[PDB]
C-alpha cells in the first residue's frame, strides 16, 4: 500500500486523483485544496453574458470522496522532495511516495502599473471564477447604456487562448440585447489571436464589427497592450501611449505557474514547470509530477481539456511507477469551444502524440484544427449545443 498526495483540486488535480484511485484503489490518495467549492472558469463567460447562472459553475468534492480520496481543505506551503513531505498552512505534514502538483496559475497583477491583487476587487480579471465572475457580471448589469467595457489580454502564454475573445463575444451578446449603445474594446498584447479569422467573421455578422456602430472593437498588439491603469479614474493606458476611459475594465494580467510550484522549485526561467511528457514527472524534482496550466506541455494550450488529458497520462504513469511497472505510451487531446451567441459557436481541437524520441508533444499530422472560416450555419448552431455537452461531460469526468 503506497501513498500519493495531490496538491490542487481543480481540473488537473481532481482528474489525476480520481484516475489514480480508480486504477489502483490500494493507493492512498490525499488531495489538498483550500477552497471547499470549486468554480469552473470554463463556461463562466456564459455567466458574464447572462445566459448561464453562476451557481451552475460550482463543483463539490463529494464525488471524489466517494471514490475513496481523502480531501483536505488547506493550502500546501512547501514540498520537501528529499523527505517526501508536503507541509500545509494548517501545520500538518503529508508523506508521499509520488506527488502530483496542479496548482493552476499565479496572476501577476502588478505587472500592469496601477493594478494589484487587492485592486482586482475594482477591475476584475475573472481569470479564476467565483466572486470574480460575479463582480464582473454585476458591473456589467449596473453599467449605464453607452458605457465602454475594456478587455485587456496579456501576452502569451496564458490560460485559455480564445477565452478573452469568447468573453468579448458574450459581453457583446449582452449589450446587443440590453445596453445597445455600449461597446467592448479589446486592447491586445498580440498581433493575432486564437481562432481570430473565425471570431472576426462572427463579430461581423453578429455585432457590427468593422462599422461605426460596432459592439466590439479589437486593437492589435503590440501598440494596444495595456501597461498602466488608474482604478479611480477608470482609465487604462496602452504601450503606444493612448488612454482609454471605460465604465467596466477587465484586466487579464500576465501569468505563470501557481505560487506553490514556484516556491517548490518546479519552475524554470519561462515561469512554468518543465516535465517529461511521457509521465509529467518534473525535470527538476524526481517523484513530483506537474500537470495542467502550471506545466509546459506545448503545443497543448492551457485549458481544462488539456489539464484533464495530462492528468490521465500522469495518473497512469504514477500508478505504473508505484507498482514497479513501465508507463505506457501517452496519448493526449484538447478541444476549446467558444460560444459567440446562442446559435453561434466555434472550436479548436487537436490530437497529440509524443514525438519519435519521446521528448516533446506534437500534434498528430493532418488532424485537428479550427471550425472552418466558411462553416455553414448548421455547424455554428450545433457547436453551442456540443459546447454545453462538453461542459457537462468534462465536469463529471473530472469531479464525478
Amino acid at each position: 500500500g503506497r501513498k500519493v498526495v495531490v496538491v490542487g483540486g481543480g481540473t488537473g488535480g481532481a482528474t489525476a486523483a480520481k484516475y489514480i484511485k480508480l486504477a489502483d484503489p490500494s493507493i492512498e490518495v490525499t488531495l489538498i485544496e483550500p477552497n471547499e467549492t470549486y468554480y469552473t472558469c470554463y463556461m463562466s463567460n456564459e455567466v458574464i453574458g447572462g445566459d448561464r447562472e453562476l451557481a451552475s459553475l460550482r463543483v463539490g468534492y463529494d464525488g471524489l470522496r466517494a471514490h475513496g480520496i481523502q480531501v483536505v481543505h488547506d493550502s500546501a506551503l512547501g514540498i520537501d522532495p528529499d523527505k517526501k513531505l508536503v507541509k500545509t498552512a494548517g501545520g500538518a505534514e503529508f508523506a508521499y511516495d509520488r506527488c502530483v502538483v496542479a496548482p493552476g496559475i499565479d496572476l501577476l497583477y502588478d505587472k500592469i502599473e496601477g493594478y494589484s491583487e487587492a485592486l482586482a476587487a475594482k477591475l476584475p480579471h475573472a481569470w479564476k471564477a467565483g466572486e470574480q465572475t460575479a463582480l464582473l457580471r454585476r458591473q456589467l448589469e449596473s453599467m449605464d447604456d453607452g458605457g465602454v467595457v475594456i478587455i485587456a489580454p496579456p501576452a502569451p502564454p496564458f490560460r485559455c487562448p480564445p477565452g478573452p475573445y469568447e468573453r468579448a463575444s458574450q459581453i457583446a451578446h449582452y449589450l446587443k440585447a440590453h445596453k445597445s449603445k455600449s461597446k467592448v474594446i479589446i486592447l491586445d498584447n498580440s498581433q493575432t489571436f486564437s481562432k481570430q479569422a473565425q471570431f472576426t467573421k462572427g463579430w461581423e455578422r453578429l455585432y457590427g464589427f468593422g462599422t461605426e456602430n460596432a459592439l466590439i472593437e479589437w486593437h492589435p498588439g503590440p501598440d494596444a497592450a495595456v501597461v498602466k491603469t488608474d482604478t479611480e479614474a477608470m482609465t487604462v493606458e496602452t504601450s503606444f501611449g493612448e488612454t482609454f476611459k471605460a465604465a467596466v475594465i477587465n484586466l487579464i494580467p500576465p501569468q505563470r505557474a501557481g505560487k506553490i510550484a514556484q516556491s517548490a522549485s518546479l519552475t524554470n526561467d519561462s515561469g512554468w514547470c518543465p516535465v517529461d511528457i511521457r509521465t509529467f514527472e518534473s525535470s527538476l524534482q524526481p517523484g513530483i509530477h506537474v500537470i495542467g496550466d502550471a506545466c509546459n506541455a506545448a503545443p497543448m494550450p492551457k485549458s481544462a481539456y488539456s489539464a484533464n488529458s495530462q492528468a490521465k497520462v500522469a495518473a497512469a504513469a504514477v500508478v505504473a511507477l508505484l507498482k514497479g511497472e513501465e508507463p505506457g505510451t501517452p496519448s493526449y487531446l484538447n478541444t476549446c469551444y467558444s460560444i459567440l451567441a446562442p446559435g453561434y459557436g466555434i472550436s479548436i481541437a487537436a490530437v497529440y502524440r509524443p514525438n519519435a524520441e519521446g521528448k516533446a508533444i506534437e500534434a498528430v499530422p493532418d488532424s485537428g484544427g479550427i471550425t472552418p472560416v466558411d462553416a455553414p450555419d448548421w455547424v455554428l448552431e450545433r457547436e453551442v449545443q456540443y459546447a454545453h455537452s462538453w461542459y457537462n461531460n468534462i465536469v463529471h469526468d473530472t469531479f464525478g
Binding site: 497520462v313 472550436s347 463529471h396
Partner: protein
Amino acid sequence: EPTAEMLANNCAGCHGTRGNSAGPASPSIAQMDPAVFVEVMEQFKSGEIQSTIMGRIAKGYSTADFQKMAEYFKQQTYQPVKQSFDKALVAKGTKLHDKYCEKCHVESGKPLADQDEYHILAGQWTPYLRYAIEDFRAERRPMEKKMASKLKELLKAEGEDGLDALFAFYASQQ
C-alpha cells in the same frame, strides 16, 4: 503504443465517462457495436460523413486505434438517458417506428446480445437523433437505400410531426 484506455479516456470530455454522455446533445457511445463504431470513425476521418468536429478528431488516429477504442466502448454498459420527452406523442411514435424502422432498428436499435450491427436509437439524446436525421435528409452522411425509402415514406405519410413522434418514442425508452 497506447492502450485502449489511454486512447479512449480522452473521449470522455465530449462523450462522458465510459461513453455515457450527460447531454444535452453529444451522443452516448457506450456499448456501440464495434464494427459500427470503426466504420463511423473511418467515415468521419475520410470526410464521407460531414461533421462539426469528429473529422478533425478521428484524423488524429489510426485504424488500429479505432479497433482498440471499439473494444473499449463495446465493453461498456449503455445507459438510456434521463431526458424529457413529449409523453402525448409516445403511442403514435411507437406505431411509426413499428411501421417504418423496426425492420432494421430492432427493439429501437438497443444493444442486444443477438443483434449484430445495431444502431442505437432508444434512450439516445434527442437533439443528437434530430441532428442525425437532418444529416441523412441533407445527405451529409450516407444511408442505405432501404433506410432512405422508409424515411421518405414516413415523411410523405406523417410529415415533421411524424419525426416528433418517433423521437418522443425513442426518448421514452429510459
